[PDB]
Design an enzyme around this catalytic site. Structure first.
Site, short mmCIF file in Angstrom:
data_model
loop_
_atom_site.label_atom_id
_atom_site.label_comp_id
_atom_site.label_asym_id
_atom_site.label_seq_id
_atom_site.Cartn_x
_atom_site.Cartn_y
_atom_site.Cartn_z
CD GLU B 58 -2.46 1.40 2.38
OE1 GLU B 58 -1.89 1.21 3.46
OE2 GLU B 58 -3.55 1.94 2.28
CD1 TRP B 80 -6.04 0.34 -0.55
CD2 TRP B 80 -7.57 2.04 -0.42
NE1 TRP B 80 -5.55 1.27 0.22
CE2 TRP B 80 -6.42 2.30 0.34
CE3 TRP B 80 -8.62 2.96 -0.46
CZ2 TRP B 80 -6.31 3.49 1.06
CZ3 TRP B 80 -8.51 4.16 0.26
CH2 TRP B 80 -7.36 4.42 1.02
CE1 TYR B 94 -4.52 9.25 3.80
CE2 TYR B 94 -5.82 7.46 2.81
CZ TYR B 94 -5.52 8.28 3.90
OH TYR B 94 -6.26 8.11 5.07
CB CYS B 146 -8.41 7.82 8.06
SG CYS B 146 -9.95 6.90 8.03
NE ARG B 166 -11.52 11.89 7.99
CZ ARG B 166 -12.50 10.98 7.92
NH1 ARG B 166 -13.39 10.87 8.88
NH2 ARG B 166 -12.61 10.22 6.84
CG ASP B 169 -11.93 0.07 13.55
OD1 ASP B 169 -11.55 -0.57 14.53
OD2 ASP B 169 -12.64 -0.45 12.70
#
Lengths: 264, 264
Positions: B58, B80, B94, B146, B166, B169
């Site tokens: 990633e 994804w 991103y 995120c 922000r 989990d």
């Protein structure tokens, strides 16, 4: 304040020597977070007398999307004079980015209205952010934003706000950053019928300039006094409709002012 | 890990009930910071077995400015797929924002090259930030970022990095966020001949989904094992020249995997 005096001591005990952009030395720590329950009183420093009127006139200038020094000048506020050019322009700093973030496709986005719409209609959002760090316009800004970014949060009718501050002068600049944003949580909260929660301050490069040592040492000699209470006299039609006369700080009995000089 | 298990307990002891975007309940706390001295070992969770290969594939995808799922798919990475459309496009998430932030005047800004230029030529900068929260393109993104923002810092030849997240989990998503950015501090550091400092994680809405209670309770039953060691076998010509084969984690002996299901 206690959380604040705890940080001051920390930069002194743990800070590494580091330098300013081709200037003064600093004692630098990286990454720190303090929490302020705003229900316990307004976070205005009592260990040096801070003056709120510059703070207020600055925030209301920001919310107007205004970036020229004229408003401040019409009310004798001289805290952005340093940065301004001949015409009083500061470039696309905070006020322009809060109220009119330019998109590549030609729009201007009002992040402050978006945020009120979110707190009113989707209070459980994890995206209630407003941002001043527009990479596209950093070359035109008088300086890059210190208070780069902030996020709102709602749990149990209490509104909280976390500010990220990329660079912090603990002595001069931090009492002002806390009072300015904390004021905004209160105005936001009033506009949305929410109670005030917590102001959480998070910083990146947190520092004390080397030549403020004496003045820090004096501030650390003082026991903090009770926090004052912020009262807003009027409920404006909107967040862009508040006036300087609308606020009063009750019960603020600080220790005296301390000045801290800067190199040029 | 210890800092992490301390947070898990915190969301359980202090978290308020709050809801997901028209879905599942959460136990939510707002604003938290943990520090990882990366010299003490790589921060891969040992209390559930995490698999680094998805993480690596990633990150290298991100650094290519790539936003289509094709690379990941050519290597069986399926994390994804959920977000992608028919064509595999995730929108300007991103990778596009890190390597080609669109300006209103038509340019595309490479924030990762800027950051290396800053760490090499002006290591004492307080502006070494890269950002994915472009307000102008949030409508086109598969989801809003995120890991919205991060900042680099240099003191005593040690490079540190603070990430602001922000929404978090804690169970699923946080072990992955720490390993992904911590890996990037090591690659960055190698490219600039700097030692690794600290990874500081700061979060906004930090949560545990209600239906992961059993699995959290199990993870909190485990004593953490020693952190592994991350070795990079090769020194590429640039940050955009690393390969999956370049990394190995030595000494990672975790407790077993725990799965955590999600509602749809």
């Amino acid at each position: 304040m206690k959380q604040y005096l705890e940080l001051m001591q920390k930069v002194l005990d743990e800070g590494t020597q580091k330098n300013d952009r081709t200037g003064t030395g600093t004692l630098s720590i990286f990454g720190h977070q303090m929490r302020f329950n705003l229900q316990d009183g307004f976070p205005l420093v009592t260990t040096k007398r801070c003056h709120l009127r510059s703070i207020i006139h600055e925030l209301l200038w920001f919310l107007q999307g205004d970036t020229n020094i004229a408003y401040l000048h019409e009310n004798n506020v001289t805290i952005w004079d340093e940065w301004a050019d001949e015409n009083g322009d500061l470039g696309p700093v905070y006020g322009k980015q809060w109220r009119a973030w330019p998109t590549p496709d030609g729009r201007h986005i009002d992040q402050i209205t978006t945020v009120l719409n979110q707190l009113k209609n989707d209070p459980d959002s994890r995206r209630i952010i407003v941002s001043a760090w527009n990479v596209g316009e950093l070359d035109k800004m008088a300086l890059a934003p210190c208070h780069a970014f902030f996020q709102f949060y709602v749990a149990d009718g209490k509104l909280s706000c976390q500010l990220y501050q990329r660079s912090c002068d603990v002595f001069l600049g931090l009492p002002f950053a806390i009072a300015s944003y904390a004021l905004l949580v209160h105005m936001m909260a009033q506009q949305c019928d929410l109670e005030v929660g917590d102001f959480v301050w998070t910083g990146g490069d947190t520092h004390l300039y080397s030549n403020h040592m004496d003045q820090t040492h004096l501030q650390l000699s003082r026991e903090p006094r009770p926090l004052p209470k912020l009262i807003i006299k009027r409920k404006p039609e909107s967040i862009f409709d508040y006036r300087f006369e609308d606020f009063e700080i009750e019960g603020y009995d600080p220790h005296p002012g301390i000045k801290a000089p800067v190199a040029i």
